[model samples]
Target chain A: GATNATINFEAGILECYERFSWQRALDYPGQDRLHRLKRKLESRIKTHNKSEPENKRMSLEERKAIGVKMMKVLLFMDPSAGIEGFEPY
Target chain B: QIEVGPGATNATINFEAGILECYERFSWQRALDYPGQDRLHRLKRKLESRIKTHNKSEPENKRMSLEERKAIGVKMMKVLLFMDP
Candidate 1:
């Protein structure tokens, strides 16, 4: 159950970025942390298993945990209507 | 005795009644406009507390029906979608 949840959240994160985009969502002020996370996720997506063989990559559980954490950070960035001034903390 | 709405009074037959009414009436759009700009964490904590309380006592509403619970879940997801940014 949690594994499926993690995968859903990972895909959700990707869809959110695809909807918002770094240019549209992060090219402005007051959201640097989101911008940073976007870059980090981008890197991770690109290089997380690049040097490894197909079966030698991360286990399902490790990928699930990592994806879940990434999704949490993505959702934590802006828990509102994308108005771009809400200091969440 | 939790009050809500423009002229809400703190009278309730039960906590669940109050929660149900407020859940239907509370304005997520306004919250997004008002407290969302500077105090979202507090807003999240406040609403999360209600969810947490309801979850703690969810078994008390064992008669609420699965369809009703699913409806509540749909509304809850609407709130979350509005907040997902």
Candidate 2:
């Protein structure tokens, strides 16, 4: 179920990215980082869907690398964004 | 992803997906030694413990519901994201 795991994990990350994109659209730092992550996530998803025989699909390890970057961005997000219960106290 | 409403009283967290994503976060390369690694490790331990507790076939009175588990998972994710580096 490695493939299934990767797919599900990617979907979860994408969900986080969507929320990040909307919540951070204004008055938030790391726009560049968020954009970079979006590009990488999109590229990975695209590459995974390619039909070439030798198109090395993303391994679980590779996905985790991107996942780490996503987590970093999430950690750095302003609590005021209210993304995932991160509201300013 | 966990969806928390105002006052933090309500949340919608998917158990399978949320738990898997949290596992993925824990799978970061150990060689990198990223900031807050210790905190991540601690959170991972807590998650594992919760999963174990969640899976045990306990008496109905003691058994945790899926919604309760989801809430626990959501709280953990919040801790993970908001944790100090």
Candidate 3:
């Protein structure tokens, strides 16, 4: 029902989008931060390859696209992908 | 007649009507590509600062699925289709 997503780069890092528990993180939007971080890490070529490579840097938009895709696939796969307040300890 | 349009006009002159674009961006189009003349021009231009990436399409099928927005698009069509005499 709360099918919306947004990002806040300034808010350090806390991802996981859920409207009911959004306040649990204190001003966080409804996106999975850990998942998002994992996503960012996945997109990185290597931490060693710094100079940041003018020719190739990971696309954030790409990461977000992948994140949404991954979320969809995961949700479809188990019906439990971030299943409503089911915190993964 | 001063047919409404967008071009080399001006930002302040052109999209001053685009006030809420600062807080959030919304679109209303029956045909989807038409983001109003001023907003449409820039949206058409590929005119932002970013290198083209390998990622082809970032389609969510929607960025927002709010019903009110869809309603806005509906009204936009009504006005665009009939309000012009």
How many pairs of residues collide in each model? 1, 0, 8
For model 2, the superposed segments whose C-alpha errors exceed 4 Å read A1-4, A24-27, A52-89, B1-85
Candidate 2, after superposition: displacement of residue B18 in Å? 9.9
TM, every model: 0.24, 0.30, 0.20
Best by TM-score: 2
Encode model 2's per-residue lDDT on A1-89: one tens digit a residue: 34334443454444443443343221122234336545765665566557435555665445544544454443344433223554556
User: Which of candidates 2 and 3 is the stronger one according to DockQ?
Assistant: 2
Query: What would the per-residue lDDT of candidate 3 be over residues B49-78, giving only the tens digit for each residue?
Result: 110220122254422222333344333222
lDDT of 1 at A67: 38
Compose the digit string of candidate 3's lDDT tens values, residues A12-78.
1112212112223211211233354445444342441243556644444443443333333322222
List model 1 lDDT by residue over A22-80, tens digit each: 22321222133335445654454445456557964554335434433443343343333
DockQ of each: 0.02, 0.03, 0.01
Worst 10 residues of 1 chain B by lDDT: B6-15
Q: What is the TM-score of chain A alone in each candidate?
A: 0.30, 0.38, 0.29
